[PDB]
Amino acid sequence: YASLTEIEHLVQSVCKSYRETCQLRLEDLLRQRSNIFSREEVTGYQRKSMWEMWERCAHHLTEAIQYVVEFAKRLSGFMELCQNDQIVLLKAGAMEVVLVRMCRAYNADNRTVFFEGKYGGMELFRALGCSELISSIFDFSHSLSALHFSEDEIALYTALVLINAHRPGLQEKRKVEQLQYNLELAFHHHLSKTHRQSILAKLPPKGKLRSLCSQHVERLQIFQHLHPIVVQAAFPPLYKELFST
Amino acid sequence: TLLQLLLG
Ligand SMILES: CCS(=O)(=O)c1ccc(CC(=O)Nc2nc(-c3ccccc3)c(C(=O)c3ccccc3)s2)cc1
For ligand 1, is residue A100 a contact (CB within 6 Å)? Predict the structure, then answer.
């Protein structure tokens, strides 16, 4: 039973861990909104091979994931879980966290995302050959931006995305349950101060994030059958460990 | 594994 002070300093350690591991500062993202891929540039991207577009994306996701691993490592409670359970939660949740973080890099006004140094719409990504998945991600980021998360809310919400007692394969399900609740308490406690609790009913449905991540792993299965050597020779080993079977 | 390495 965490006391209000224990819950307050859990808030503290989560928001600090996120500050230190947020990859890009929000203001650097907002500043770049005016930098948008031009017609020729978007065509250039569309005309790339599938193998080259996937390989670029694999690198950029791996880089994002490295920051999430760090976020978890600094998360109060996470390192106190058993090794197996740490792996289980990261394997299931690293991508989910990244997708949540990425709404920061989504510009709802022109419907673009920050990618390779500029902003571009979902058609930039055609060469990947998973336009349904990509359009789903754009819709998801669109839906998250309407909640106007602060950075502290992202910290708290991503901690919860990661600390999810419902993942299969846990050796100590009960420990994770306890940390999750303390984090739910932490999130509620923070939302009460700011008088922000009305975002809770507008949060993405349970399952929606897991669904997006499932589609991604499936589209990588299609791609890997088409280019098994590229994945083996050029994909980051971490990406392969996380998303490859 | 890599996750294990990244974690320590
Ligand atoms: C995330 C921490 S942050 O500080 O907010 C932050 C740091 C660095 C960036 C630049 C960056 O990496 N942008 C990318 N955007 C997509 C992307 C692609 C399609 C739809 C939406 C996003 C990337 C992918 O490869 C990818 C491929 C398939 C599925 C999903 C994604 S990589 C952005 C945010």
Answer: no
Q: Is A58 helix (H, G, I), strand (E, B) or coil?
A: helix
Query: What are the tokens at A28?
Result: 């650097």
Q: Which residue has the tokens 């910290």?
A: A155
Radius of gyration of chain A (CA): 18
Ligand 1 atom 11 nearest Cα: A115
What letter represents residue A139's amino acid? D
- Residue of A87, A55, A218, A187 lying closest to B4 (CA atoms): A87
Q: Is A149 in the pocket of ligand 1 (CB under 6 A)?
A: no
Q: Which ligand 1 atom is the nearest neighbour of the CA of A98?
A: 1
Structural domains of chain A sorted by starting position, each given as residue range(s) with its CATH number in brackets: 1-245 (1.10.565.10)
Measured in degrees and rounded to the nearest 5, phi and psi for residue A148 equal 45, 50
**Strand pairing class (A112-115; A118-120):** antiparallel
A31: exposed, middle or buried (C-beta count within 10 Å: 0-12, 13-18, 19+)?
Answer: exposed
Residue A56 near residue A204 (C-beta atoms within 8 A): no
A26 conformational bin, left if phi > 0, alpha if psi -120 to 50, beta if neither: alpha
Whole-number Å distance between alpha carbons of A77 and A128: 38
For residues A16 and A149, give the distance between their C-alpha atoms in angstroms, rounded to a whole number.
16
- 3-state class (DSSP) for residue A36: strand
Provide the token pair at A29. Answer: 């993202």
Q: How many Å apart are CA A144 and CA A147, to the nearest integer?
A: 6
- CA A75/CA A53 separation, integer angstroms: 33
- Give the pairing of strands A106-107 and A118-120: unpaired
Report the structure determination method: X-ray
Residues 6+ positions from A100 with CB-CB distance below 8 Å? A144, A154, A157, A158, A161, A209
